[PDB]
Structures are given as structure tokens and as C-alpha cells.
């Protein structure tokens with residue numbers, strides 16, 4: 001019933017930009033936390049951005065790494081999470097994942113299949 | 122930035138043996154609301170991560186009961202009592218109490234040769 005499907009990755013040269021999308025269904029969107037996590041090809045999961053539900057004023061929190069370059073947003077009418085990425089560089093190349101929280105106290109209870117982003121011309 | 126130190130990096134096991142993975146936060150991880158948002162994740166080869174344990178210790182629904190988490194202060198352990206082929210992959214501990222939220226370096230559970 002719960003679905004998360006990312007989209008928006010691609011191949012891009014340094015300094016360029018992209019907008020990731022996360023379409024969802026199977027739950028009342030506005031009531032859950034949503035997040036963006038990425039994993040460079042070697043490496044470890046890395047939390048990037050996060051945005052809370054309506055009861056929490058849709059507050060957000062960013063990782064210093066993407067601070068001021070990335071910006072998260074959510075379209076509550078359509079139940080879609082996005083991510084505007086600017087001034088991209090090598091350390092940004094990875095698979096990006098969207099995830100929704102859990103009411104009993106958990107981040108990333110559900111994950112989308114993630115999309116790829118490759119930087120470097 | 123609260124650092125999450127995971128150990129070991131490589132844990133070779135034999136199917137059916139117990140196995141323990143540990144984490145180590147560099148500071149307390151108690152959120153101001155009282156909860157300790159320490160979870161464990163499992164990323165199988167090619168798949169996306171899966172939630173195993175939340176709030177240090179609560180096994181997420183649908184997760185095999187061979188998984189269990191525990192800990193106190195800055196020490197957290199994820200235990201697997203009977204390793205199944207399907208449990209092979211990379212495990213990540215994660216703290217979602219203090220910003221910026223942080224994962225451990227990951228622990229690769231693999232077949233012992």
C-alpha cells in the first residue's frame with residue numbers, strides 16, 4: 001500500500017543543477033516526515049535534508065554539507081517531495097533516496113528505490 | 122556533529138551463528154523529548170535500506186525476531202541470534218536525535234569462507 005518512487009537523477013557537469021522528485025501514495029502525506037538520504041558508490045548512508053509533518057509546521061533541517069545549495073520542499077496537494085540541487089560537484093554523485101517516518105518514533109521507515117546522480121565532465 | 126562509530130567493519134559469519142554489531146555515539150543521543158532515536162538499518166546488495174530497529178530497541182513490524190537491539194549511554198548493540206542467507210548485507214546504525222543526523226560507517230555481514 002505504501003509507495004515511494006524517486007525520479008530526477010541523471011548525468012550532469014560540475015556547477016550544474018537538478019530537481020529530484022518523490023511521488024508517493026498509500027498514506028495521508030501531510031502527516032509524515034519525509035527525508036532525502038544519499039549513498040556515494042563506496043560509502044555510507046548520509047542524511048541530507050528532512051522535513052516534518054503538518055502538526056510540526058513542516059519544519060526542516062539540513063546537513064551543513066548541502067546547506068545553502070540544496071533545498072527541500074513538499075507539494076502536499078499532490079503528495080510529492082522534491083529536492084532542488086544547485087552548484088553540484090563530485091561528492092554529490094550518488095544514489096538518492098526519499099523516505100517517510102513512522103508514527104511510533106522512527107525516521108526512514110519506508111524507502112523509495114532511489115535514483116542515480118553522476119557528476120564530472 | 123555527533124559521530125557514530127560502528128564496529129567491526131567486516132563481520133564474517135557462518136549461517137546459523139549468533140552475531141553482534143556495535144555502535145558508539147560520541148555524546149548522549151537523548152532527544153529533548155526524552156526518546157533516543159537510535160535505529161538500525163540493513164541494506165541488501167542492490168536493494169534500498171530497510172528499517173530493523175527504532176528507538177534503540179523496538180523491532181520494526183515485519184522484521185524477523187532474530188533481530189534485537191539494546192544499549193545505554195553511548196553504547197548500542199544490534200544482535201542477530203541466527204544468521205540467515207537473507208540477512209547478508211551492510212548494517213547501519215543511525216542517530217536521529219541531534220542535528221545533523223548521522224549514520225555509522227556500516228558493517229558488512231558476509232559468508233565466512
Ligand SMILES: O=C(O)CCCN/C=C1/N=C(c2ccccc2)OC1=O
Nearest residue numbers: 031032033101102103104105106107
Ligand atoms: O502513525 C500514524 O498513523 C501517523 C501520524 C503522525 N506520525 C508522524 C510521524 N512522526 C515522526 C517521527 C520521526 C522521527 C523521530 C520522531 C517522530 O515521523 C512521522 O512521519
